[PDB]
């Protein structure tokens, strides 16, 4: 059976990435079962500490370190196992009364926010891996269209003449704070609250600093009540995936501009567009649509979660929102959706200069040009060539047809004097090439400080990788230390006590 | 004429920090108005780099820029001159045409960009310096209750003994992220987008260095795209905003409630109380309720921001809406307010103890007793321990009336066996300063712990203020620098060309 | 296996209400999954309209109708077919070609607008069923509790004696305004878009009244373009559930402050609280805090629809936030538990008395008093009786041991003169109970005002009962006729052609 | 001094609906200031009201109501005079200690909750006169263009020929529904809560119905609680506006993309668009984007009010967030804005007619033309005319163009065999008029369709108007009885008693 919305001009499959964005609804854990894992690894953290605690004999350790796994196969089908004290009340039932002693100097309410801030942590890196994807993609995508002129706007108005390789690295601008944004949310993320137990930790002799250290932890949130009370990073969280997510709506949104019937200047991949059931002329921005449908939809947790503490008092509460697995797997999708329209999207080259050619965006060069060539002010200047523009739009005139008698004239209605400038004056003005040419600062579309803003931001990309490459080994790392702790307890057990 | 509200129970004068929360939206700015002084500055700086660059000869540069002091003057009575085209035409009638060269490289786009991120970077340096004023009364007031027992709450039920100085440093350790979260916007912020021009730089030879110097950013927002379409910033001002505020909401919330009739476990000074009009036992929190409207309303700004930038593409667009200098006041009037309440509040100690010893808060610790000293699980214990308190609510007995024969009768009844304990360690496991003293590790509410938590705040604290003060010094210079550039050039021209 | 939270003083098992607030996250559908079903029987109703038309023989149609049972069977457990054109294909693979002529004069744009209304209606009706429900509990409760005493509060501050029967037709109240702003929705959301095909209708001779009867529908959405781009009724449902759940968690909050260890004037009912895994002494609010959390949620969908119509043109568009079937689910659950809450709590009405008797409520009476028994005007009178607080709560007197020597003293105090009341006038003015009795005006707390309040509210009750089973008979009279219209073409077509 | 901003394209004034956009920020009173008149209102009516109980006497009642004039021409200049307390003190100063006695049976609580019902019952009318003013502009344009042949848009993709008198005709069925919701809100808001008092009422014997007369109230809110707690018609009026406003965006979304340089299908009026200070080519839409800033602002008080009844229990609140005269303002702005936007709108009705006859919105008829002529099934039709548009679109050539031996080849390709239809069938079912033509079922862009829409709506809007009327003059009524009321008081003290 093919895929039965491929018809018509929906050619071919879909890209998997635009197929993310059909998929992620149904297949969302709900937060319950996306945190689970994380707490079993709690337990064992937890657990392993007590015993260098001595809190717990290495007796006792072993044998609810092997419960923990028994307890784990049977909650892997069993959704009802997967919150607490079901869970605990399974490892009794499995392993007996010693099942009792893993909550030593802890809480349901420590437990949940360590949980959810180890589920977070590794969505974000997930996140910040996309957003790099996302971002290498623009940018790889631009170093190809340092000459590729086109118009840039303002106000959905044809404004003046850049390049697409000049557009684009605006957005890599756009993505390289975002990727800041991210960063900066990740150190306050990766605290362990654990050892706060309710709210005002305990008399027992727990290390704090070893369970953290076991988790990935980087540091320790520190005050107890700020353990089970702190959710502004989860606020957070829903406010910078919020704000990236409303820069990728609006390129969405100039992409789906430029592909419109009337623009024309870009094209979606077929493999990035879809049809419509009853007008077969249809090449739908479906990618597009969802793409910013996420990005909406991102606004409901950020206000859903400041309301919760907005209505609370500094305590622990099960009042608060939470940022669920749903809408991180929203945004996943559409910026893998994204990624990969940009990569393939289609510039339409031809139109686009024609556009830059013949639609008035040269006129701020040839306002600059009068004030250059005959010192005329720029406010005075600017009024002569308004008025070349209403002339020449009243006869028809493309603005790559202006020339020295349409500029004279103009002058001369306008201010009573004509204006001494020559035709090839004029001609260079309007030229939309030289107009990008002539843009050579920083940040300014001209190829070679385009191409600057490139290099710049591939080694950017590569400090962006470095980064996401040293959070998630140092993660592995400690998980492999807990499973390596966790069996050397169990096998001393088995055969040597 | 006294102020009329002063009456009954609300003596003496509104604190000023009271008082503020009632001014502010009279008093508040528009955004034109608050802005209007930093595109002043722009107009100098910009006409002083293009001065430097050969653009403007000293004689223009000097005619611009006494003119701009003349118009400047004409605008603080005549508001209609505060937004750019009026105001260049007051500079045209002032020193002739020549003003319409101030424009040239430039455009409002880049001009109201810079313009209100000079604002936001103002109220930026103003709202930390507010937050660092919050953060120094927590901390002082903690100092001086390390020994004030009292409970701490869980979904509004008492959970454990703490202290208020303990409680405090979490408000602290709060406010130290929201500082840093600050700190990390304001890098984004203090970068500046002229030069952008429309949206795509300019072919006149700018250097954008300089005028970013003058004007005192510390780097330039450097794609001309970014330079005018970029607004994350302004979602970010907004949702640090919010995220703190709630935080604040939760402060008041937790004053509020420990300040009813039924708790009476705090009051607040009468300068930051009200009365009723009709009712004359009233002592009304209108301080807390009203800091608490403050970070409601903060909401709308950050979604207002959101929603316009989800609805355009990435340019420059009259449509993106605002933070305005309301919403700000708001802020600094909700921050100074509970910075004062805090300062001022009033501990019933007395009421705060009896609570912790009576209401059975102590009961985890009796758990724990049992625990360590039977070796029973920590589920079998807390059953026995549950059951005492039902026993013991049945029975009115207060938590610190509990002894030896009530917990052997609860867990006889509970387990069919007694329990081996003694009368001493139940009275020990029940006494709530010993609750606190138990509680000795990191961020937990023992005198000696929250001591080096203190400690910790303190140095914080200093590096938080150095922080200010050079950041603070960096725009001073700048504008030192570039007010000297002006007179330098006025001077030269008026006496020596 | 019993249920694992059920411990301590969490004692029997959870109300089914409560534990709805459990269950809706990983048992809710997905909005294809939950509007499927209303899909189907729009192809239905389609189909069978075309064959009033002529548009299809009743040959085709019965071959057509035959064929969506099929597919509705396999649809059912391969959620992959819940979409439309994998849908048709199903039906073309299942009956040949003429599958395809049942999308005739029609689009996935008003089929889809028509299935989510139809959905969207059906959760209305389920969702004004719940909200009856709820109000059905609160004013039942109230009728017992008339002569119950007790405070109301403003802001959090005790302010005069009222019934708990009062305070629960305050919540009558909202419910029936709730109740109308449903039912104005109502009316919005019944309307047929079928007809509009794309969005600009078709030239096929559809009967469109016929399609919305056989459908359930009170009338049209007349213009084609309305029909597909119209979805204010999709944020106003969202609206109505957040405005109506605000109201809902002003009212857990007010029961969780009553229900705190200082209030003790409630306590929820053991099966609508819970416990804690650490300390043994909690009954704690979940269902409340829980009830709180999908208010605060609610907030969601509300701001991501009304969102992505602010970025969008009058037009379909794929890039709408929906609202889906958990946030409704959330708010039934919410809505339930809620319903049991109050239903089942338990007033501690010695010490609700006690508070209105001791803690100064009486005192606006006492004022009231000394106005109508010597003339005085309020503002005086208040100034006195606010003395006598201040005295009263200086020398540890409670109100209703407040006689007339405290009275002449701060009337002397305060005014340097006495006055002319007794000692009698004094303790009826601070009888709460008296109190009571005098406020009898229209909504005010005496028995008999109550009463007339309760009658109302039930001869309410009864309309909105009735608008309920009117609504909903008349969707189902519709679905029978259709359901035998279909077997009416089936069988003819197989027995008699 | 003329306008500075016209200059170049942005030719003569700015419309006075277009300036408004510009002056509402600056002009907006607050909410303390705009309240004010109606409590001055309010202290007549509550005072005539104890009078006509006997509560005070006329002698009494004539001080008092002469007081008011004076102090209220004090307050006229003197913000500080237009709270509540320091009122009632210049009025103290003013006329004697009797100024205490207006304050009998009454709180600041329902005192306010009045007022703000007043103002916001005022600002509704003006609302709903300014949406009616709207609607009208949206229908008489429609009567014009009832043959103005265009193309709709779906997905921002042409889709199919209608009229752009047929477009209009949506949005007034959308204003429409809008007027109903606004209309459903007033019934709410024109609600008396005096009598209240603080929350329970009072002793005191007064006639709520007296009071509600007086300031034009419909009824009362008659539980005292609901009185002073109830604040979901605030929410519900923030909701409607944003709703209603979102609308709005999408219409001015949808002219700003007909008015790009790239469709061109239609101009701005000069005396709606604005230009840029360095682009002279610049005709900007500022009226359209400025418009969409306050339907996204407006999104803030929603949130915020929202956040602010879930955040507090069900009580008199100083916490709670207002709808402010600033939001209430942007939104007449917005509305005069676009009514003369929409009056003054150029189609280019050639270009127009070109697109609907050259870009393939015509191909849905020819489909439909074989499934007609040819019984072929809709999918197989469809998937023809796709690859007639695939092969026209590879080939270069406009829909209009498209003959038989097209659509012969395409056949063949896509299916292996012709198809039996004519070149006059296919002309025909391409031909775009004739498109809109077959189209002639409800809410169809048939002209006779739209007419009978427009003759639909011509009625409506005489009822909204009649509506207003209605009740507008009940309002004057109400103001008239309680002037005179007042006269005859004052009067009859000066000359009889
Ligand atoms: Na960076
Ligand atoms: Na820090
Ligand atoms: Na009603
Ligand atoms: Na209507």
Not at 110 to 118: E, F, I, P, V
Not at 251 to 264: C, M, R
Not at 335 to 345: E, N, S
Not at 415 to 442: C, F, H, M, Y
């Amino acid at each position: 059976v093919p895929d039965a919305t491929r018809i018509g001009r929906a050619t071919g499959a879909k890209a998997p990435e635009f197929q993310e964005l059909y998929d992620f609804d149904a297949a969302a854990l709900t937060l319950t079962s996306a945190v689970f894992p994380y707490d079993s690894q709690i337990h064992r953290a937890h657990v392993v500490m007590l015993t260098e605690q001595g809190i717990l004999t290495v007796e006792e350790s072993a044998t609810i370190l092997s419960g923990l796994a028994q307890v784990d196969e049977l909650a892997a089908t069993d959704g009802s196992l997967r919150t607490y004290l079901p869970y605990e009340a399974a490892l009794k039932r499995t392993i007996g009364s010693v099942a009792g002693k893993m909550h030593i100097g802890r809480s349901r309410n420590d437990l949940a926010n360590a949980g959810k801030r180890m589920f977070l942590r590794d969505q974000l890196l997930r996140t910040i891996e996309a957003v790099i994807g996302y971002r290498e993609a623009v940018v790889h995508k631009a170093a190809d269209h340092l000459d590729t002129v086109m118009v840039v706007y303002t106000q959905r108005k044809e404004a003046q003449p850049i390049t697409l390789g000049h557009y684009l690295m605006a957005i890599s601008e756009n993505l390289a704070k975002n990727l800041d944004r991210y960063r900066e949310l990740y150190a306050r993320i990766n605290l362990c609250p654990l050892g706060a137990a309710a709210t005002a930790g305990t008399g027992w002799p727990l290390n704090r600093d070893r369970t953290s250290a076991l988790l990935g932890f980087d540091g320790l949130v520190v005050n107890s009540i700020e353990g089970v009370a702190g959710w502004d990073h989860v606020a957070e969280h829903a406010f910078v995936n919020a704000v990236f997510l409303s820069g990728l709506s609006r390129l969405a949104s100039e992409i789906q501009l430029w592909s419109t019937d009337e623009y024309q200047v870009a094209e979606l991949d077929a493999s990035f567009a879809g049809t419509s059931s009853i007008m077969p002329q249809k090449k739908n921005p479906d990618s597009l649509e969802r793409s910013r449908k996420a990005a909406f939809a991102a606004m409901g947790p950020l206000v859903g979660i400041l309301t919760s503490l907005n209505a609370i008092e500094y305590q622990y509460s099960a009042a608060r929102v939470e940022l669920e697995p749903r809408s991180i797997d929203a945004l996943i999708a559409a910026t893998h959706a994204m990624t990969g329209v940009v990569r393939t999207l289609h510039p339409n080259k031809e139109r686009m200069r024609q556009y830059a050619a013949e639609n008035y965006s040269t006129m701020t060069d040839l306002t600059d040009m009068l004030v250059r060539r005959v010192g005329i002010d720029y406010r005075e200047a600017h009024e002569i060539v308004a008025h070349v523009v209403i002339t020449a739009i009243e006869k028809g005139i493309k603005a790559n047809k202006i020339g020295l008698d349409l500029v004279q004239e103009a002058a001369v209605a306008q201010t009573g004097a004509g204006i001494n400038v020559s035709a090839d004056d004029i001609k260079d003005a309007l030229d939309p090439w030289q107009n990008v040419l002539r843009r050579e600062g920083k940040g300014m579309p001209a190829p070679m400080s385009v191409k600057a803003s490139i290099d710049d931001a591939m080694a950017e990309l590569h400090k962006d990788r470095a980064w996401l490459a040293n959070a998630t080994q140092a993660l592995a790392n400690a998980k492999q230390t807990l499973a390596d702790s966790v069996q050397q307890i169990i096998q001393t057990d088995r055969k040597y006590l």
